[PDB]
Design a protein around this ligand. Structure first.
Ligand code: CDL
Ligand code: CDL
Ligand code: CDL
Ligand code: CDL
Ligand code: CDL
Lengths: 54, 135, 365, 124
């Protein structure tokens, strides 16, 4: 009997806010400022060498 | 017997198939040495051990063979200069991260800025006084 | 029976330090193919005592790796040789790994055992994936109070003569001469009666050991010599908060001094929250100490052990590319760029998994 | 579809690397996070939260996906005198009642059979 089960059709989509995006988030937080910050300073500059540059 | 048995065994001493394509350090560490670290003597021991494995601890082969520099450090000053030009704030940020972990007081930070900007302000006045002497 | 398999043999006194064979217990893992772990017990201490730690379902360490509970030379069932040079004792393990067809292994140790584990990585780093040291440090412990007692007890054990002394004479000797309960129990269980009850003796070489400790020089087990060098691979240190062997104040610096990749406290060096108790050295007895060691041990084996230096964790395997040094490859027409370093199978030498998968890859194409 | 060997683990856990001399000096400070994508992973906030209403609400959602589960839901939400859907068993009172009321009902079955067998004929 369990094998005979089926699945209902779910809703197509929920509400899509016309003024919020992943790159331009509507509300503010320090998390998004952190993403923009580490994109500016770039990722950790990992050295492949065995001795320091200086 | 077991010692020589494994030394002769090809499987025990065999480079992987891709070993040729891998990046190979062509130095034992004698080109750029750390002179003032507390493990200084420990570093030399690993250089001495690496030189011995290459010659089966018959260092006469090393004395007769060719000695080479660390060609991996070539053009390292130019490369860091271009990275500083590409993104100076990122280059400065990460090169000073471990140092900036210990932040001094507000007073000290202010003294740095105040004395630095004051020195730049006097430098500008001396540039102006030179234009007064030229006139 | 099956999970617990300890090869059986008789110790052999050897004049040559290279003709030394190591013996110990092997704990099989739950899964078919798993990398191997080699663990060294405290000096003069039984391997069996560590079985409940590595065979506890709550910890489930065997789910990660196969464990070789191995005895160093002059200890337990392994061969006997007066020299205790960590370079010689490290080559012994390399021959064991060869005879057992082990390409590379995870190394662990307790106390002085931790030193033995780290020495192998120092002398044979290309074949060691990681080191996990418990209540030990690559340091000179000749003047540590904990070592002096062990150094003192071993000297007292040389006074007993089993031929003349009776069984009761021994028990009275230990209680009075040995105050520490754990050391006392360890030494009692180390006494064994040879076949035909000819006489009783210690499983460990009491003569060769006392000379190493009593002489109290560079070759002493308490000492860590500069000759041992540096360990290049992954290393994690775990010790009690109040430990007589490793003091948090200054005994952590040797880790940075000897291990190049050790990041520092909170990443590769941890202390277990505990009270002042001379028995805290034996973490496997107290659940609180063991539960933390196991969690930290399982974390080292799962995410940090056998991972390239410049990679943070095992998660970065296949998605983080390491920069390449210029003029490091033989090919001249090579555009230098970032690459993900190669991580090989734990026993790729003594199997043909690469030869097999190469064939399967061709069938796809 | 292909599943491989149940015993074997992923090749990541088996694949290892070893160190050598020289060693890179650089100590990694942070993990690289160039792309902000953490999909298909559940939040770690859901760690030590006690039983609450979300447990019986999500249970019905999953039970309603099965035929036998739909019967349990309808019966529980209609034919159980409880002031809350957060069911907590601290006693076996309701369990023993249902057993004594059932195992006892099947009494007299043998005595009933004896009536038929014994009422069949008279020994005399
Ligand atoms: C027409 C011809 C004219 C042009 C000709 C062309 C010539 C152009 C010159 C370019 C030269 C090549 C450039 C190479 C890169 C930059 C130089 C460099 O050393 O980088 C490597 C150096 C470290 O080398 P590394 O081995 O790669 O790093 C390993 C570790 O990550 C590092 O951290 P660690 O702690 O883990 O490891 C040890 C660490 C330990 O040491 C340190 O980490 C240093 C600690 C510093 C951080 C402490 C906090 C202070 C910083 C706060 C930020 C303030 C600035 C930003 C705020 C305002 C916004 C602008 O490093 C060391 O070993 C010792 C430090 C190096 C020796 C001392 C150098 C001192 C001067 C460097 C700073 C410049 C000061 C300003 C001077 C300019 C005056 C206008 O990087 C830095 O520490 C910072 C670099 C920033 C330099 C900016 C100035 C560039 C101009 C360079 C000219 C030479 C200096 C002249 C000043 C003379 C005064 C005495
Ligand atoms: C019959 C008439 C004939 C007329 C023609 C006569 C001409 C005779 C030609 C024959 C002479 C050449 C002989 C062939 C050499 C072959 C040797 C060899 O195999 O390569 C070695 C050499 C080795 O370099 P590497 O192994 O690849 O790596 C270097 C290390 O990693 C080091 O790199 P690093 O990253 O570690 O940093 C350190 C580096 C860089 O360190 C520095 O910081 C110095 C930077 C100097 C440039 C910048 C000066 C500052 C002012 C400007 C500011 C620029 C930056 C500003 C940034 C922006 C500011 C906001 O230090 C160096 O100086 C490297 C130079 C290469 C080593 C040679 C020994 C130098 C010792 C003397 C030093 C003082 C002289 C410096 C000369 C400039 C060198 C680039 O490679 C070469 O450079 C070969 C150069 C030969 C090029 C020949 C091209 C054709 C020549 C003919 C064209 C027509 C000329 C017409 C002239 C007309 C009359 C004027
Ligand atoms: C030592 C102590 C004393 C120091 C004294 C002061 C030193 C000089 C200060 C200069 C500061 C000017 C800043 C300019 C704006 C920078 C704003 C910015 O966001 O930076 C990123 C910015 C890059 O942003 P981007 O525009 O989006 O370019 C990225 C593209 O992907 C790029 O595409 P790509 O990847 O395909 O290109 C390859 C890449 C790497 O290749 C190279 O760059 C290496 C070779 C470059 C040639 C050598 C440069 C020579 C100087 C340039 C020419 C003269 C000045 C031009 C005017 C520059 C001022 C805007 O090129 C670049 O990195 C960017 C292009 C470099 C400029 C080349 C063209 C120059 C002509 C500009 C024409 C447009 C302006 C109109 C004319 C303005 C005059 C009226 O960097 C630059 O553009 C150049 C910055 C140069 C800074 C050098 C020195 C910095 C460190 C000084 C340390 C001071 C000491 C205190 C430190 C304390 C530490 C404790
Ligand atoms: C193109 C133009 C070329 C010309 C200009 C060239 C300029 C080049 C300057 C480049 C940068 C200098 C090198 C810095 C290396 C990187 C930073 C660093 O040092 O690593 C951090 C490291 C320790 O800092 P930390 O790790 O962050 O630990 C601190 C804690 O986190 C928290 O703090 P704490 O609780 O542990 O202790 C309190 C606090 C103590 O509070 C302080 O930090 C004291 C600083 C107060 C402000 C001083 C005024 C600002 C100076 C810059 C403006 C110059 C004014 C105009 C000069 C006119 C005359 C030329 O400690 C500190 O935070 C650091 C003090 C250690 C001394 C810092 C290095 C000396 C000061 C900078 C030298 C400036 C020279 C500029 C001109 C040189 C011309 C030849 O410092 C060291 O390297 C240790 C070295 C031993 C220092 C003690 C003995 C020094 C005795 C010589 C004194 C020389 C005075 C020079 C006077 C200049 C003329 C008046
Ligand atoms: C209801 C009760 C009251 C509630 C009040 C509400 C408070 C709200 C707090 C809001 C916090 C804001 C957070 C954002 C700012 C954080 C970033 C920051 O820079 O903080 C420092 C922050 C923390 O430094 P720290 O090492 O942790 O030390 C923390 C404290 O200083 C502690 O250091 P310490 O433990 O060593 O203590 C020693 C202390 C010892 O001090 C004493 O024992 C006595 C002080 C006596 C002062 C006598 C003054 C005499 C004046 C004579 C002048 C006469 C000339 C007048 C001219 C008249 C002309 C006719 O000396 C100092 O610490 C010097 C600190 C300088 C303080 C300057 C302000 C003083 C008065 C503020 C009054 C505010 C109302 C409070 C009323 C409370 C009354 C009970 O520094 C950083 O590391 C961040 C980067 C800083 C870079 C330097 C440049 C920063 C400047 C821009 C900052 C942003 C914009 C401006 C913000 C305001 C800055 C003043």
């Amino acid at each position: 009997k369990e094998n005979t089960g089926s699945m209902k059709k779910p809703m197509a989509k929920a509400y899509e806010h016309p003024y919020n995006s992943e790159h331009h988030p509507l509300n503010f937080s320090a998390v998004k400022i952190a993403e923009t910050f580490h994109d500016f300073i770039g990722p950790e500059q990992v050295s492949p060498h065995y001795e320091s540059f200086a | 017997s077991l010692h020589e048995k494994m030394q002769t065994d090809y499987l025990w001493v065999k480079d992987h198939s891709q070993a040729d394509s891998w990046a190979k350090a062509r130095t034992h560490g004698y080109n750029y040495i750390a002179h003032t670290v507390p493990n200084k003597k420990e570093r030399y021991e690993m250089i001495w051990r690496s030189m011995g494995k290459s010659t089966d601890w018959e260092l006469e082969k090393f004395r007769l063979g060719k000695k080479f520099p660390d060609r991996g450090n070539k053009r390292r000053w130019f490369k860091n200069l271009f990275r500083l030009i590409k993104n100076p704030m990122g280059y400065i940020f990460w090169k000073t991260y471990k140092a900036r972990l210990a932040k001094p007081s507000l007073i000290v930070t202010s003294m740095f800025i105040g004395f630095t900007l004051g020195f730049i302000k006097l430098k500008a006045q001396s540039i102006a006084y030179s234009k007064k002497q030229y006139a | 029976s099956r999970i617990i398999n300890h090869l059986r043999g008789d110790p052999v006194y050897q004049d040559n330090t290279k003709d030394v064979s190591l013996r110990g217990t092997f704990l099989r893992g739950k899964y078919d193919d798993l990398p191997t772990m080699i663990f060294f017990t405290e000096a003069c201490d039984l391997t069996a005592n560590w079985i409940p730690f590595f065979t506890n379902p709550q910890y489930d360490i065997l789910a990660h790796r196969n464990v070789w509970l191995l005895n160093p030379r002059n200890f337990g069932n392994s061969d006997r040789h007066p020299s205790f040079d960590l370079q010689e004792m490290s080559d012994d393990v390399m021959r064991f790994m060869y005879s057992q067809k082990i390409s590379m292994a995870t190394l662990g140790g307790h106390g002085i055992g931790g030193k033995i584990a780290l020495a192998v990585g120092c002398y044979h780093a290309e074949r060691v994936t990681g080191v996990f040291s418990i209540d030990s440090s690559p340091m000179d412990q000749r003047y540590h109070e904990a070592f002096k007692e062990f150094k003192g007890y071993v000297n007292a054990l040389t006074e007993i003569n089993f031929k003349t002394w009776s069984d009761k004479d021994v028990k009275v000797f230990l209680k009075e001469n040995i105050k520490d309960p754990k050391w006392r129990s360890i030494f009692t269980n180390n006494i064994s009666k040879n076949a035909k009850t000819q006489s009783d003796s210690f499983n460990f070489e009491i003569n060769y050991l006392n000379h190493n400790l009593n002489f109290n020089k560079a070759d002493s087990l308490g000492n860590w010599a500069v000759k041992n060098g540096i360990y290049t691979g992954r290393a994690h240190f775990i010790f009690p908060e109040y430990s007589r062997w490793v003091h948090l104040a200054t005994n952590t610096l040797p880790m940075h001094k000897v291990c190049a990749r050790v990041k520092g406290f909170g990443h590769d060096i941890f202390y277990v929250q505990g009270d002042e108790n001379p028995l805290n050295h034996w973490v496997y007895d107290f659940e609180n100490y063991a539960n933390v060691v196991a969690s930290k041990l399982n974390k080292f084996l799962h995410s940090y052990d056998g991972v390239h230096a410049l990679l943070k964790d095992r998660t970065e395997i296949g998605n983080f590319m390491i920069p390449d040094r210029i003029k490091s490859r033989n090919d001249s027409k090579h555009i230098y760029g970032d690459y993900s370093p190669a991580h090989l199978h734990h026993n790729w030498r003594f199997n043909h998994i690469y030869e097999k998968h190469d064939e399967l890859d061709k069938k796809l194409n | 579809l292909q599943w491989g060997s149940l015993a074997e683990r992923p090749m990541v856990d088996r694949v290892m690397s070893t160190s050598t001399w020289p060693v890179p000096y650089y100590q990694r400070l942070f993990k690289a996070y160039p792309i902000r994508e953490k999909k298909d992973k559940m939040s770690l906030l859901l760690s030590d939260i006690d039983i609450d209403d979300t447990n019986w609400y999500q249970a019905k959602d999953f039970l309603r996906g099965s035929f036998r589960g739909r019967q349990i839901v309808d019966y529980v939400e209609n034919n159980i005198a409880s002031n809350t859907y957060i069911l907590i068993q601290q006693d076996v009172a309701n369990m023993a009642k249902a057993y004594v009321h059932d195992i006892c009902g099947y009494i007299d079955v043998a005595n009933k059979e004896n009536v038929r067998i014994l009422s069949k004929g008279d020994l005399i």
